[PDB]
């Protein structure tokens, strides 16, 4: 029930944080 | 550009718009997105512990503790701000959004950090908190940014989050409010930004259940049209008024 919502929040967190690393490394190449 | 108004588990229209955005800005684009969304498995990122005030911390230790929590949540480069802050809501609701930030543990941007900074200093009555907002010019367009001014035991400082390390926290070492603002100004100089407009609020109440909103615009200065001596004149006048605790919201 609240099973799929908590698994989905957890994968979205992992995806957001994957994406945040690549975006952070990108914004430094542009800045440099 | 985009803000998440759909809660947590982010809805699909907001989810796709995040990815669609990032595929444009990134050179690798559709490949870099494919690699994340389709990965069979991904490491669960560690969840930083919400900082707790200990009897062995000084006020500087606490503000560094709070600031380090914010640095660990990480600045949000995804293009989609994850918590909605309605600037003009009563503190009570902003306070709840702050709790939600510590539960969901995602990246944050400048305004979210200020709300969260208020939340984590609400239990220390000797720390006064007031917002500081800048409007800036860089190579064509205007930029807005906000930090949390801190006043404590005769010294000024700040908490916040920014893309740049020099536009966030400032140690509690500035003897006047003018000195702190001028340090932000010179920090902005290093990135070719011209400071157009500086906005300073009132002290924020310490009661987490307050019905009144945040005053963001008590003092407003078009510093690009002003010489140094007149900016300092007005900030010191206003900072004296803050500490004498006499002011009524604008």
Phi, psi angles (nearest 5°) of residue B20 = -55, -45
The residues with which B134 forms a beta bridge, in sequence order, are B145, B198
Instruction: Check CB contact of A23 with chain B, cutoff 8 Å.
Output: yes
Contact between B44 and A24 using a beta-carbon 8 Å cutoff = no
Q: Is the dihedral angle over the CA atoms B119, B121, B126, B129 positive or is it negative?
A: negative
Residues of chain B neighbouring A32 (CB-CB closer than 8 A) = none
Q: How many distinct structural domains can be found in chain A? A: 1
**d(C-alpha B35, C-alpha B26), whole Å:** 13
What is the number of CB-based contacts under 8 A between chain A and chain B?
57
Contact flag B77-A27 (C-beta cutoff 8 Å): yes
CB burial string A20-31: b at 16+ within 10 A, e below: bebbbebeeeee
Query: Which residues, 6 or more positions from B148, have their beta carbon under 8 angstroms from its beta carbon?
Result: B113, B114, B117, B118, B129, B130, B131, B132, B158, B159, B160
- Residue span of the structural domain in which A25 resides: 1-32
For residue A31 the two structure tokens come to: 């800045």
User: What is the 8-class DSSP label of residue A32?
Assistant: -
Residues of B in contact with A17 (CB under 8 A): 45, 74, 107
- Please give the biggest Cα pair distance in chain B: 61
> Which residue is closest to A21 within chain B, CA to CA?
B77
Among the partner residues B15, B43, B78, nearest to A14 by beta-carbon distance? B43
Q: Is A7 on the interface with B (CB under 8 A)?
A: no
Q: How many residues does chain A have?
A: 32
Residue B85 CB contacts under 8 Å (≥ 6 apart), including other chains: B94, B97, B111, B112, B115
In contact, B177 and B126? CB cutoff 8 Å: no
Choose from B33, B43, B45 for mutation: most chain A CBs within 10 A: B45
Cα gap B32→B164, rounded to integer Å: 25
CA dihedral over B33, B39, B43, B47, signed as positive or negative: positive
> Up-side HSE of residue B196: CA atoms within 13 Å toward CB?
9
End-to-end CA distance of chain A: 48
Q: Which two tokens stand for residue B98?
A: 């702050």
Q: Which of B240, B223, B242 is nearest to B231 (CA)?
A: B223
**Among B104, B113, B29, which Cα is nearest to B76's?**
B113
- B176 φ/ψ angles, rounded to the nearest 5 degrees: -135, 160
How long a stretch of residues is chain B?
A: 250
Angle subtended by helix axes A3-31 and B12-25, to nearest 10: 20
Q: Is the dihedral angle over the CA atoms B116, B119, B120, B121 positive or is it negative?
A: positive
d(CA B158, CA B173): 10
Give residue ranges of B with CB < 8 Å to any A CB: 8-10, 15, 18, 22, 25-26, 32, 36-37, 39, 42-45, 74-79, 82, 104-107, 163
SS (H, E, C) chain B: CEECCCCCCCCHHHHHHHHHHHHHHCCCCHHHHHHHHCCCCCCCCCCCCCCCCCCCCCHHHHHHHHHHHHHHHCECCCCEECCCCCCCCCHHHHHHHHHHHHHHCCCECHHHHHHHHHHHHCCCCCCEEEEEEEEEEECCEEEEEEEEEEEECCEEEEECCCCCHHHCCEEEEECCHHHHHHHHHHHHHCCCCEEEEEEECCCCCCCCCCCCCCCCCCEEECHHHCCHHHHHHHHHHHHHHHHCCCCCCC
């Amino acid at each position: 029930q609240k099973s799929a919502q908590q698994e989905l929040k957890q994968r979205q967190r992992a995806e957001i944080y994957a994406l945040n690393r690549v975006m952070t490394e990108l914004e430094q190449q542009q800045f440099d | 550009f985009h803000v998440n108004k759909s809660g947590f588990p982010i809805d699909s229209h907001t989810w796709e718009r995040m990815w669609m955005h990032v595929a444009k800005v990134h050179p690798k684009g559709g490949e870099m997105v494919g690699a994340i969304r389709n990965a069979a498995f991904l490491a669960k990122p560690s969840i930083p512990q919400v900082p707790n005030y200990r009897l062995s911390m000084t006020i500087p230790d606490w503000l560094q503790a709070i600031q380090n929590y914010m640095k660990t949540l990480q600045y949000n480069h995804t293009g989609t701000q994850f918590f909605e802050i309605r600037k003009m809501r009563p503190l009570s609701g902003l306070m709840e959004t702050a709790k939600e930030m510590t539960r969901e543990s995602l990246p944050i941007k400048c305004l979210e950090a200020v709300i969260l900074g208020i939340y984590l200093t609400n239990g220390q009555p000797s720390i006064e908190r007031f917002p500081i907002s800048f409007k800036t010019y860089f190579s064509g367009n205007y930029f807005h940014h906000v930090v949390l001014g801190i006043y404590c035991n005769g010294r000024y400082g700040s908490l916040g989050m920014s893309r740049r390390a020099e536009l966030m926290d400032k140690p509690l070492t500035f003897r006047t409010l003018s000195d702190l603002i001028f340090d932000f100004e010179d920090s902005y100089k290093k990135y070719l930004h011209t400071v157009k407009k500086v906005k300073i609020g009132l002290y924020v109440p310490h009661e987490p259940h307050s019905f009144q909103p945040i005053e963001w615009k008590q003092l407003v200065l078009n510093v690009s049209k002003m010489l140094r001596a007149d900016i300092r004149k007005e900030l010191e006048k206003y900072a004296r008024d803050m500490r004498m605790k006499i002011l009524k919201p604008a």
